[PDB]
Amino acid sequence: ATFEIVNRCSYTVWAAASKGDAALDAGGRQLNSGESWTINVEPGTNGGKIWARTDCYFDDSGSGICKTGDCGGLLRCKRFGRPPTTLAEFSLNQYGKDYIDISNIKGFNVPMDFSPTTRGCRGVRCAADIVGQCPAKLKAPGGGCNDACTVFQTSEYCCTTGKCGPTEYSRFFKRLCPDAFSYVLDKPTTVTCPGSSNYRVTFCPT
Template identity: 65%
Template sequence: MGPNRLQLRRVGSGRGRCQTGDCGGVLRCTGYGQPPNTLAEYALRQFNNLDFFDISLVDGFNVPMDFSPTSNGCTRGIRCTADINGQCPAQLRAPGGCNNPCTVFKTDQYCCNSGSCGPTDYSRFFKNRCPDAYSYPKDDKTSTFTCPSGTNYKVVFCP
């Protein structure tokens, strides 16, 4: 498989390891996968009867993604299909993906633990390649999208 594909080795029924996004060796993940991983995030039937959705690179990037509404007159989909793994800065490189700087450096500047942080050169690397995706934790204004509740969605990995 190429560098933009998840690599899975079966070890037994219901168990296996992924090069990126691994969930402690179980195939039915009930928690968070190990970074780097591209995330599709959504909250349905929220404030003002809206669905909120985004693609997040806050945990890094491993596979390209398309997250699009398919009904309800909502047409604004989002994509992150850039060659982030191939262009990843050396300090953020990981097998099969590109880490977010918080994962690597663990400082408030990159993790936003104090509540006050802004974009960095590393977050701009992600944002320049995937303008619709979250690039750091406070990147709400350009990265959260809405549709009326009841909308159907399609999430495609490696479009």
């Protein structure tokens, strides 16, 4: 499957793509304002994620640091990034169907649209000013708006027992971005697309 990753933000982002134990494609690249990066994701990929990283410094070997979404200091991510990270999540070719969603379970750093470029399903977006409106206790110094699990590490926010409810903090994310997951047991906002669809992820869509 092809994903075109587009940076419409006015600032540089460092895109990342991983399935948690391996890179997808090259795993990461710098995207200046307006740049597009096309990656190929193997069919059958389960549990893939794409995110943006902000305020990164990398040396010649591709080693460095980012203020949001750092993936163990590497330009080319093999593992998932440090919150806060708005996430585009996907599982491809799962019994004939692809499943896509956007998630704020690991917080929010950059607004995002995640849409098919082929026919037969709808896209999803979270493009509100979550950082500007972020509750004081969730604001990340480096930028972004952390989720409450990351900040407080309780069973209720992390849904550790498999039982949890919405919270004042999850409801903040949900109010601003209804079509994104706000906590682990949120009513799913997953979209079902035809197997083998292609997609575009746009940072700062509006």
